[PDB]
Ligand binder design. Structure first.
Ligand SMILES: CCCCCCCC/C=C/CCCCCCCC(=O)O[C@@H](COC(=O)CCCCCCCCCCCCCCC)COP(=O)([O-])OCC[N+](C)(C)C
Ligand SMILES: CCCCCCCC/C=C/CCCCCCCC(=O)O[C@@H](COC(=O)CCCCCCCCCCCCCCC)COP(=O)([O-])OCC[N+](C)(C)C
Ligand SMILES: CCCCCCCC/C=C\CCCCCCCC(=O)O[C@@H](COC(=O)CCCCCCCCCCCCCCC)COP(=O)([O-])OCC[N+](C)(C)C
Ligand SMILES: CCCCCCCC/C=C\CCCCCCCC(=O)O[C@@H](COC(=O)CCCCCCCCCCCCCCC)COP(=O)([O-])OCC[N+](C)(C)C
Ligand SMILES: CCCCCCCC/C=C\CCCCCCCC(=O)O[C@@H](COC(=O)CCCCCCCCCCCCCCC)COP(=O)([O-])OCC[N+](C)(C)C
Ligand SMILES: CCCCCCCC/C=C\CCCCCCCC(=O)O[C@@H](COC(=O)CCCCCCCCCCCCCCC)COP(=O)([O-])OCC[N+](C)(C)C
Ligand SMILES: CC(C)CCC[C@@H](C)[C@H]1CC[C@H]2[C@@H]3CC=C4C[C@@H](O)CC[C@]4(C)[C@H]3CC[C@]12C
Ligand SMILES: CC(C)CCC[C@@H](C)[C@H]1CC[C@H]2[C@@H]3CC=C4C[C@@H](O)CC[C@]4(C)[C@H]3CC[C@]12C
Lengths: 393, 393
């Protein structure tokens, strides 16, 4: 990379660091105890998760390049022009500066005239604009490639699946919280925000409950897309394995989230059917967790193979130098696959609100971390032994 | 330069920027009107000027390298392990972060126990330690070369002059304010600071007055070193020109600063000899400015030459692309050589107390800027046509 690119990476990282420190200190001093800070947390959580995802993605690209995994051939990107990790670090740092500035302005009151609710709106409006700018400025080829890919994923039955389509839909399975925060923000300004008050951003009413049957559809949105892609892939190929077995993996989420919305609704009423539904919500919690975990370990990463030989419990060939990495990865995935399922059901109105909001906010970055670790061995098991059969050489 | 070096340059620059912005805002809000902020300004001015000097020096090194001026041969540095501009930018950024942090802590009160006067002391103590660290860490070769050079300059009659000795003594002629701030700080804590009070840094006294006669000797410390070096050069070379004419250039400062302590001293008394002294101070103020300016233009930069030809008013060969640079430089040097002499006389108490401290604080960075511009054409006129007769090829 050129020297100005590394200069810009470091510049944005340093501004981000100091902005974070002053954010924490203003939080522990300037803020006032009486008002509620939760809408404010629920609104900014999505941008935080997006920035973290881009940073971790930049570390993924560095790891793939150094270890020798040909990720340009698998994604079928152009050999000549490709983003390297420094460009991703730069985008992450810039969007992080805007996030820190908007949140800081929401804590302070730098301008009297401007109402506080404007700042959250001004941040997310800018991000959409940067992505959809018509002019050939600011990584225009990257934004255009991403936009064409996004169009194909959201219209799933109609296109032939390629590695990139399959890959982005999975990433969207772990980023579901951003969609929920967006539906929550869209709902909140429309119904529970009083526009007339000068500082109405920090005011419960009905804006954080799975009651109007919308929040369930919103977390089943990515699982539905992957289930549909698996069915289309089965149509073309005509092989029941592994396309019909994989679709079921994605269908388990429907039953589990269906039951959340059911026990919570029955409980809130004076109904005695609540116990029965509670028996079922639990059963479709262990089934889903075990099914996703076994699929991860044996089919996604390709471990526990018969001819492992020396690398015991692993596969025959390994690309990353240390076996410790693989063993820590196995244990980490095992303990975080159990954490993911609980936060999914919980979002759909289960545990009384006071204790629930701190579990989701703590466990969302850990789900992004689990996807970050999943990327390494998935791409490695693709490069070695053609696992998805997307190229079929 | 390696990528980690550029990353570090940008990191320290970004932290420095945000620290400066919060410094300004805390100055215009947190600070209190009743107490005096001048001791606090006179103490930190020296560190500010040192940081600015290092940054501008880094720009000088970039300019010399690109234009093709062999500054490694002139300074006689080792061709294998030289420093580049990025390393200077890095030192400047790091020391600037420490300066901003210490001043910020002096504005706030982050720790109750610690008295405020400790922080100025903690900053300058660290800087000395970084320079004199015995261990081979943190640019140990650079610090050792600089330390040997400094020893030779402060013991001037005893060593043979080389380009590096002559060059550092001149740089010290424009950095005289740092010495004054140091003598002022050394004096202030000892006599006018009441140790018992918790916040006595921002309390007037005898500290800034040129009376005991100490401040005049500190004013003429660098001019004396250059005058002595010129006499030594004439002893070895046996040439009355330009070593006896150049020594006089440096001797004019003695008469100039001797008529400031005198007029100021006579005025404060009920003495009628004050008028006579004032008519002499102006005469030497004007004889010094013209002498230094003519020497600069004709002997240091080598302009106004007879065989200029096409480059009119310039010399025959020019290395920097645009003539506009040379013309702006001539005008800038002409108008700043008049500014330099006023603040030298003024420091030794010529004006009233209120009308003087803002002139020195504004005109000190402009003197550092004039030396920054002087460096380009001095090194260029050395590389072209060997002017100082130091190598004598
Ligand atoms: C909260 C609301 C905010 C709205 C968003 C606002 C902020 C978001 C802003 C985003 C602007 C751009 C962000 C960085 C990505 C740019 C594209 C890119 O990097 O492609 C890289 C591919 O490299 C890879 O193959 C690995 C994948 C990299 C990222 C893939 C998508 C990541 C974003 C997923 C996010 C999903 C979001 C969906 C909804 C959550 C580089 O491609 P290329 O090498 O340049 O290709 C050129 C060669 N070619 C011409 C042949 C193609
Ligand atoms: C009260 C407030 C103040 C309190 C006091 C604070 C004090 C604390 C201050 C701490 C600051 C310490 C600064 C460290 C700088 C390292 C030195 C350096 O860079 O040498 C460079 C010289 O390279 C050149 O000659 C190129 C241009 C000239 C620079 C020479 C002097 C630069 C520093 C002038 C500074 C003037 C400052 C003087 C101050 C009196 C690099 O040398 P090299 O290329 O690595 O040579 C190696 C090859 N060799 C082995 C053959 C040699
Ligand atoms: C009071 C003041 C306090 C001082 C604090 C100091 C903070 C200073 C921090 C950061 C200052 C900025 C450093 C820029 C570094 C660029 C990095 C780079 O890629 O080098 C490029 C050029 O390098 C240049 O062109 C240098 C030009 C610097 C101009 C800065 C002017 C700022 C006003 C590439 O050069 P090359 O590839 O070698 O050819
Ligand atoms: C900032 C404005 C938004 C940009 C967001 C990304 C960070 C950034 O600024 O870098 C942008 C410039 O940006 C600058 O040069 C100004 C700083 C960099 O975008 P670019 O110049 O298109 O990057 C070139 C990449 N390419 C040559 C492979 C196409
Ligand atoms: C919520 C969180 C949000 C984060 C927002 C993002 C904030 C911005 C954060 C920016 C931090 C970026 C730091 C790396 C900068 C690399 C500079 C460099 O020279 O790369 C070199 C090494 O490249 C690497 O080794 C990358 C390793 C990154 C480790 C970072 C761990 C931090 C914890 C390139 O090496 P080469 O190309 O082999 O030569
Ligand atoms: C901090 C201490 C600051 C002292 C110097 C300024 C910044 C800095 O630290 O860079 C220092 C390291 O620094 C790091 O490794 C990261 C800190 C860099 O100092 P250095 O590693 O000696 O630089 C190597 C230069 N040399 C290889 C030509 C000898
Ligand atoms: C239980 C917890 C501690 C498990 C932690 C697992 C994490 C830390 C492990 C699992 C996979 C590991 C990564 C595997 C591959 C690479 C690529 C290599 O070129 C750099 C190290 C890097 C980036 C490893 C970093 C550490 C890593 C992310
Ligand atoms: C009256 C005022 C505005 C005069 C200003 C003069 C200043 C701005 C001029 C005079 C000498 C000039 C420098 C002369 C040489 C170089 C080296 C070249 O490779 C980069 C530009 C640079 C660094 C110039 C920057 C601008 C400069 C510093």
């Amino acid at each position: 990379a050129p020297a100005w690119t590394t200069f810009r990476v470091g510049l944005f990282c340093g501004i981000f660091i100091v902005l974070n420190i002053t954010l924490v200190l203003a939080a522990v001093f300037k803020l006032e105890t009486d008002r509620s800070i939760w809408p404010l947390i629920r609104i900014y959580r999505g941008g935080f998760l997006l920035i973290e995802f881009l940073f971790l993605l930049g570390i993924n690209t560095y790891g793939w390049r150094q270890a020798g995994v040909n990720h340009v051939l698998i994604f079928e990107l152009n050999p000549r022009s490709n983003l390297s990790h420094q460009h991703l670090f730069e985008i992450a740092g810039f969007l992080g500066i805007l996030w820190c500035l908007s949140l800081l302005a929401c804590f302070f009151a730098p301008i009297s005239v401007i109402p506080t609710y404007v700042y959250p709106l001004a941040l997310y409006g800018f991000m959409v604009f940067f992505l959809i700018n018509p002019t050939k400025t600011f990584y225009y080829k990257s934004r255009f490639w991403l936009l064409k890919l996004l169009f194909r994923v959201f219209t799933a039955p109609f296109h032939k699946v390629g590695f990139a389509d399959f890959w982005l839909a999975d990433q969207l399975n772990s980023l579901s919280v951003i969609l929920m925060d967006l539906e929550y923000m869209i709902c909140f300004y429309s119904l529970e925000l009083k526009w007339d008050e000068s500082k109405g951003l920090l005011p419960s009413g009905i804006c954080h409950k799975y009651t109007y049957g919308v929040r369930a559809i919103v977390q089943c949105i990515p699982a539905w897309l992957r289930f549909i892609q698996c069915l289309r892939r089965y149509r073309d190929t005509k092989r029941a394995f592994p396309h019909l077995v994989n679709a079921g993996k994605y269908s388990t989420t429907f039953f589990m989230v269906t039951f959340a919305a059911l026990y919570s609704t029955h409980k809130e009423r004076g109904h005695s059917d609540t116990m029965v539904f509670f028996y079922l919500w639990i059963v479709f919690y262990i089934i889903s967790s075990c099914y996703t975990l076994i699929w991860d370990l044996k089919m996604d990463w390709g471990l526990f193979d018969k001819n492992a030989g020396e690398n015991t419990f692993l596969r025959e060939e390994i690309v990353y130098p240390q076996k410790a990495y693989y063993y820590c990865a196995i244990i980490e995935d095992v303990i975080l696959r159990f954490a993911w399922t609980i936060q999914i059901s919980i979002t759909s109105t289960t545990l009384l609100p006071h204790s629930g909001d701190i579990i989701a906010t703590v466990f969302a970055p850990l789900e992004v971390f689990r996807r970050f670790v999943w990327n390494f061995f998935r791409l490695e098991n693709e490069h070695l032994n053609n696992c998805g059969e997307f190229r079929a050489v």
